[PDB]
RNA sequence: UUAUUAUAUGCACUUGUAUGAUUAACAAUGCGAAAGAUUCAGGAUACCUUCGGGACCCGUCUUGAAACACGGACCAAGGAG
RNA sequence: AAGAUCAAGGUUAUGAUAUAAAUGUCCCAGUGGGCCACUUUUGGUAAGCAGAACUGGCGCUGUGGGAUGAACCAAACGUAA
RNA sequence: ACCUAUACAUUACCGCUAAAGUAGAUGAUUUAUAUUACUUGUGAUAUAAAUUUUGAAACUUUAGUGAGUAGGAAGGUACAA
């Protein structure tokens, strides 16, 4: 059940690997299995299942060699640890300070206001679109998203129009808007555990009464010795 | 007196069917059995003796005429149709794909029977479709 | 066929018609027709000089014997006749380009052995004209790289 | 400030016959596949032999390839010349060899073909 | 639309302004078409800067942009229908561009023609025509 | 005597590392929406505008020409190794 | 004394390099009016003067720099980031 | 510390030079398998799939470099016949 190393991800180029195998090391033991099979059946009664010579056989257009598939190296982050309350510097919420509380998969952010307060919804951002302040909220009451996953939020659906297959349709379903019930039922559990960490620290610009403000670096304030 | 070696040297600028149009280095062959319109050394009449020709049908779309080639025997000496040979085929492509590997001992040219099988059903085809309509 | 050789009966041909008959069936049709419809107003000035323009130099029939050939052929465009004699260089490659259709009578085939002997026999009229010796005797450099040997 | 690439980089030496002949240059091409597949320098000298103008080219007479002759370990030889053989009157005795020659001179074929000795094209060589 | 000539690299046009010819600008009978000042006065032989740009190798176009039209596909000079055959294979480098000496009885066999192959031609709309 | 390193570590699978110009996983958006034709991106075409910087008149003899050196108002066509 | 025949010899007997070099043909153009600077100098008080020695530029060379500039400095210019 | 030439480094790209191969297609080569031979594992053969008809007086492939008058050579373009 294993045997392992690869260490040089450090080192950057280097054993511990090849050393232990050794001190292992076996001289004796080698026989091996693997079995193929192809299903190539030309299975003729008459069933007579081949396929032949479909084609790549030359219509002549020339379509460029599928470049392939860059490893899944996982995205490591920068010092953004959930729920650490940072800055929406950016798309709508412009200016809006929001409680992190996933990582993802994709990379990026899962961000909620809580939005009973600073008006932000289950909404993920960009790892670069964010200041890291310093304050943090515990992290540790939430349902997490294990629940919230990429395929949660993707839309239930796009269709180019009322459901179906081809009726020749019409301009204007919900490309944003409608909203779902699921989704409303996510945020309200999520955002009322938030308010409850939230409120046990004092009024001001971004936690709970804190929350609502809309941020002020103030004329003759100053983005570079801001240590957020 | 007759090589596959000469023949292009010979002529190689001075050919009528081979028409230039621009600069544009090399080509045009216009050369009945070109099968690749190139113009290369392969894709000509001599060469010698493995020279498919492909014309459709007269009337849409019995026919994609197929020329089979001819070596060596007959020297390829006019005509009695000896580079070439008229299988009148029909039906479905695939097929006749398939069963000219078969008359691919002379496995040359493969590409080019191809890209003028493939290009015939461009020729034929637009009498019932050239559309759309679903 | 290629060479073209037809019986010495075409020699005799007084007649244009009876000539076109012979031509067609001994497979011209195509190339004579290559002819007449080609003819095309010259594109210069070239039109003033009687330089009316150019069309297709169609078969060069050949004749050992003018029996009533030549005026018979002469009529019809783009078809010259020539003697076994004469053999034009002009007529046998126009334009440097060679390749015409030839098409010889059976007594002017059979003339153009003495005429030009072959390698070891000598070239009749042509008084030291070796008919040059051939540099590749094969030529074909394929079947020599193929080669076994090789 | 490239310290020095001045002169010459334009070298010396034709890569392929200076000359129209269709026929020569299948032979330039055939000695060409004969050269890095077959090593040796017979092939590497005769692809190099068929490049050289009508000047380094100057017929060889047919009582040379009969001095030739009287040289040690050569009796059973295939005389190569890359070249126009030409008719030597004053050799008496023509000795039998096969000459295999780019172009030899109707006079002197006969002679070769007299000695009883063939006249042989490269390719067949 | 007219499916586009096998896969380009984007058509660096590297200097698009023609070249003029030294002082056309200042007269009409210096013609725009470009003539090298060899001349022992010439800033523009020598390279000064701002006198504009002498055609210089250097904007020469990759080998594999030269002849494409952005729609991909290179000029072929069509005569008429057998000249136009000819592309049947080469859609995908080609475009007949129908030469200006055509009567358009002849153009529209060969915009017929052009449709049945599926190669592209360029000018069609050409010599076309609210006319006999 | 001890430490370190390499060899004795095969076979299967692998979106693993490189394979010597290794940009793509993943995703969003415009949109090809029949003809018709929206929308997006991109551009010193002609020419206009707005900003910076650079641009003195060619031909020529001459060591050197923008010269307060010489021919050339402007344009067409003849026109010279 | 040469030509020179024969036998003996560990490592080829300073250092970097070779953009390959040598050689021939054309009897080829273009040139036969030079100009400037470091250094060295003659004539002349001297000259942006007349004339050498060595070497580099300019002549045929912009660009960056010396505000400017044929020549001084830095640098030799395919096209761009 | 900063600024900054067409210099300098790297990269794409042009050209010129360099350097190497390319030319068994009744054949070759790759891939998958069934059979057979040997052996662990490989080849032969059969079958199915795929690639390959090269201006081989050019391409693929490669690297180093480009001022330029006089002048020389090379290769095109236009014009009338």
């Known amino acids: 059940k294993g045997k392992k190393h690869p260490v040089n991800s450090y080192l950057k180029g280097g054993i511990l690997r090849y050393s232990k195998a ?22 003729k009664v008459p069933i007579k299942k081949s396929k032949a010579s479909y084609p790549t056989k030359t219509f002549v257009k020339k379509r460029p060699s599928k470049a ?66 310093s304050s943090k909220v515990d992290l540790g009451a939430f349902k997490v998203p294990e629940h ?11 269709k180019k129009d009322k459901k179906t297959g081809e009726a020749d ?31 046990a620290h004092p009024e001001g610009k ?22 957020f | 007196a007759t090589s596959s070696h000469l023949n292009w040297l010979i002529i190689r600028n001075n ?37 498919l020709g492909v014309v459709p049908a007269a009337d849409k779309k019995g026919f994609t005429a197929v020329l089979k080639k001819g070596k060596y025997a007959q020297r390829p000496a006019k005509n009695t149709v000896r580079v070439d040979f008229k299988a009148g085929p029909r039906r479905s492509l695939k097929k006749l794909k398939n069963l000219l590997i078969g008359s691919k001992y002379r496995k040359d040219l493969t590409q080019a029977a191809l890209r003028r099988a493939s290009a015939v059903l461009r020729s034929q085809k637009p009498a019932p479709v050239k559309g759309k309509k679903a | 066929e290629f060479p073209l050789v037809v019986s010495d009966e075409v020699q005799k041909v007084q007649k244009t018609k009876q000539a076109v008959i012979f031509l067609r069936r001994l497979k011209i049709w195509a190339d004579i027709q290559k002819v007449y419809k080609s003819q095309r107003f010259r594109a210069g000035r070239g039109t003033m000089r009687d330089r009316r323009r150019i069309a297709r130099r169609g078969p060069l029939v050949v004749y050992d014997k003018d029996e009533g050939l030549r005026k018979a052929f002469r009529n019809i465009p783009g078809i010259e006749t020539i003697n076994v004699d004469k053999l034009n260089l002009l007529k046998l490659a126009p334009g440097g380009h060679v390749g015409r259709f030839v098409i010889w009578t059976e007594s002017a085939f059979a003339r153009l052995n003495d005429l030009f002997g072959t390698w070891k026999k000598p070239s009749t009229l042509k008084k030291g004209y070796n008919l040059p010796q051939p540099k590749m005797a094969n030529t074909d450099l394929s079947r020599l790289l193929k080669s076994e040997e090789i | 400030g490239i310290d020095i690439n001045h002169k010459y980089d334009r070298k010396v030496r034709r890569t392929e016959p200076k000359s129209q002949d269709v026929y020569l240059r299948l032979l330039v091409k055939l ?24 000047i380094n080219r100057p017929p060889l007479s047919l009582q040379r390839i009969a001095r030739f002759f009287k040289a040690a370990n050569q009796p059973e030889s295939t005389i190569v010349v890359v070249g126009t053989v030409t008719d030597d009157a004053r050799l008496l005795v023509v000795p039998k060899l096969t000459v295999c020659a780019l172009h030899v001179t109707q006079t002197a074929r006969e002679r070769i073909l007299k000695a009883g000795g063939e006249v042989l094209t490269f390719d067949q060589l | 639309m007219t499916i586009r000539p096998a896969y380009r690299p984007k058509i660096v046009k590297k200097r698009t302004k023609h070249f003029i010819r030294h002082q056309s600008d200042r007269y009409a009978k210096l013609s725009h078409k470009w003539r090298k ?5 010439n800033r523009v032989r020598r390279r000064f800067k701002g006198q504009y740009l002498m055609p210089n190798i250097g904007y020469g176009s990759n080998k594999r942009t030269r002849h494409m039209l952005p729609t991909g596909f290179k000029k072929f000079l069509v005569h008429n229908v057998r000249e136009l055959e000819v592309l049947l294979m080469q859609n995908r480098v080609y475009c007949g561009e129908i030469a200006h000496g055509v009567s358009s009885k002849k153009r529209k066999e060969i915009v017929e023609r052009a449709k049945q192959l599926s190669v592209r031609l360029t000018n069609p709309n050409g010599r076309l025509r609210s006319q006999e």
Do not use: W
């Not at chain 1, 050794?22 to 299975?43: F, G, H, I, N």
């Not at chain 1, 309350?85 to 990582?103: D, E, N």
């Not at chain 5, 000042?37 to 006065?41: A, R, T, V």
């Open chain 5, 37 to 41: 000042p060899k001349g022992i006065d």
């Open chain 1, 22 to 43: 050794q001190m292992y090391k076996r001289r004796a033991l080698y026989r091996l299995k693997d079995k193929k099979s192809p299903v190539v059946e030309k299975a």
């Open chain 2, 15 to 51: 050919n009528a069917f081979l028409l230039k149009k621009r600069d544009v280095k090399k080509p045009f062959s216009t050369e009945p059995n070109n099968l690749a319109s190139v113009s290369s050394y392969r894709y000509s009449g001599i060469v010698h003796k493995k020279t």
């Open chain 1, 148 to 158: 919230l996953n990429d395929a949660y939020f993707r839309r239930l659906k796009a």
């Open chain 1, 169 to 199: 349709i019409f301009a204007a379903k919900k490309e944003r808007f409608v909203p779902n019930e699921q989704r409303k039922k996510d945020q309200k559990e999520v955002d009322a555990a938030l308010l409850k960490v939230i409120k």
């Open chain 4, 31 to 54: 000695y060409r596949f004969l050269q890095r597949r077959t090593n040796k320098k017979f092939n590497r000298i005769i692809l190099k032999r068929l490049f050289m103008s009508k």
């Open chain 1, 68 to 133: 392939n598939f860059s490893e899944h190296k996982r995205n490591t982050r920068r010092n953004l640890t959930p729920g650490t309350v940072l800055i929406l510097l950016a798309g709508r919420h412009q200016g809006k300070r929001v409680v992190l509380l996933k990582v993802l998969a994709s990379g990026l952010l899962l961000v909620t206001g809580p939005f009973a307060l600073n008006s932000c919804p289950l909404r993920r951002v960009s790892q670069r679109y964010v200041i890291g302040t």
């Open chain 1, 206 to 227: 971004f936690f709970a009464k804190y929350l609502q403000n809309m941020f002020a670096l103030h004329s003759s304030q100053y983005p570079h010795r801001m240590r």
